[model samples]
Each structure stands twice: as C-alpha cells, then as structure tokens.
Target: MIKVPEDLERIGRELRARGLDTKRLLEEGPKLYPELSIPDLMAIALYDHLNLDPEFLYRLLQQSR
Candidate 1:
C-alpha cells in the first residue's frame, strides 16, 4: 500500500472528498500557485496517482495557500 505522512494523507483524503482530478489539479496549479514551476508541475504529474499520491496534487494546491 502507498503510505504518506499523516498530514499528507489527510490532504489526499480532502482532495478526493472535493472530487478533484490529478490532471485537472495540475492545470490549475500554476494559476493558483505562481511559485510552482513547469518542472514542479511536471514532476507532480509524473509521480501522482489518485489512490497512491493524491497528496502530490494536494501539495500543489496547498503551496498557494
């Protein structure tokens, strides 16, 4: 099973509860988090899985807030 840190896990759960997509999140990522580089977003896209690393997407979202 894929396991993240506790807080990261919670962030993943929240993303799923919010019904967000991993790819869609990346689309919104640069807009919302200006600090996120294309490379950063690309890394997330390559690494993320809905069930395994939703936190990766959530981390992109959280970086802005």
Candidate 2:
C-alpha cells in the first residue's frame, strides 16, 4: 500500500494516465493469476502506478502456483 507524503489525489490522475495497462490486465491477468479477480489485477496495476517495481510483479507471478 502507498503511504507517506502521498497526496492520494494523484492516484486518480495516475490511474487514468495508465489506461494501456488495463488492456493487458483484463486480457492477460486472468491467464496469469486464475485465483485473482479483476479487482486484484486492478490493485496490482495501482501498486505499479504507485512506484512498485515491475520486477516484483514478475516475481509474484513466478511464485504463484
């Protein structure tokens, strides 16, 4: 989760600006994480927008059964 000095307001702007990710999230995320729902895909995308390292995402996919 994002914290500290975060305006929180920028999340809207940041998310809107990242519409491209939505396509992959909706289409590919299901194949990647069958246990995860649309909201989870969205939340992961949100974390990415909040400066979460992309490599961590890959690692999560790797670790998942």
Candidate 3:
C-alpha cells in the first residue's frame, strides 16, 4: 500500500501549483510525483493537509487488489 502522510495539503498545493489535478493526481500520483520522498509522504500524513478522500484511495486500492 502506498502510505501518504497526514499533512498532504501543502504537498497537494505544491502539486497543484505544478499543474496537477487532484483526481488525476490520485491516479498518477506515484509515478508522476516520484520525487515525493518517503519523508514528504510522512509529513503530509502527519499534517493531514491533503485534499484527497480516504474512500477514493480505498476504492483505488481495491481495484488494484
């Protein structure tokens, strides 16, 4: 499973600034934002700032599963 940190809002904003859409981001986040190191995911999760829905993530995971 791909674990993202709590404080993802800041990172999301940064991604958005870089022309990434949240929906597409959720789909392509891993490969598209490979530069997002583990530390970054941890920080985002810790802060709980990302605008993504947990349910959406769950659904995506289930599909892959």
Task: Compose the digit string of candidate 3's lDDT tens values, residues 1-65.
Answer: 23532225545555566665544554455565686654444333333345456445434444553
> By the TM-score metric, which is better: model 2 or model 3?
2
lDDT of 3: 0.48
* Alpha carbon lDDT at 10, candidate 2: 39
Per residue, candidate 1 scores C-alpha lDDT tens digits across 1-65 of: 12333444543354445555677756765665466556555544444453445555456645754
- Best candidate according to TM-score: 1
Q: Is candidate 1 or candidate 2 better by TM-score?
A: 1
Candidate 2 stretches greater than 4 Å from native: 1-22, 52-65
Which structure among the candidates has the greatest lDDT? 1
Please give the ranking of all candidate structures by TM-score, highest first, separated by commas: 1, 2, 3
Worst 10-residue lDDT window, candidate 1: 1-10
Q: Which ranges of candidate 1 are over 4 A from the true structure?
A: 1-18, 50-65
Give per-residue CA lDDT, model 2, range 5-65, as digits (tens): 1322233244445463756555665675566555546556655446554455435544552
What lDDT does the true structure give each of the candidates? 0.51, 0.48, 0.48
Q: Please provide TM-scores, in order, for all candidate models, with all chains considered together.
A: 0.41, 0.39, 0.33
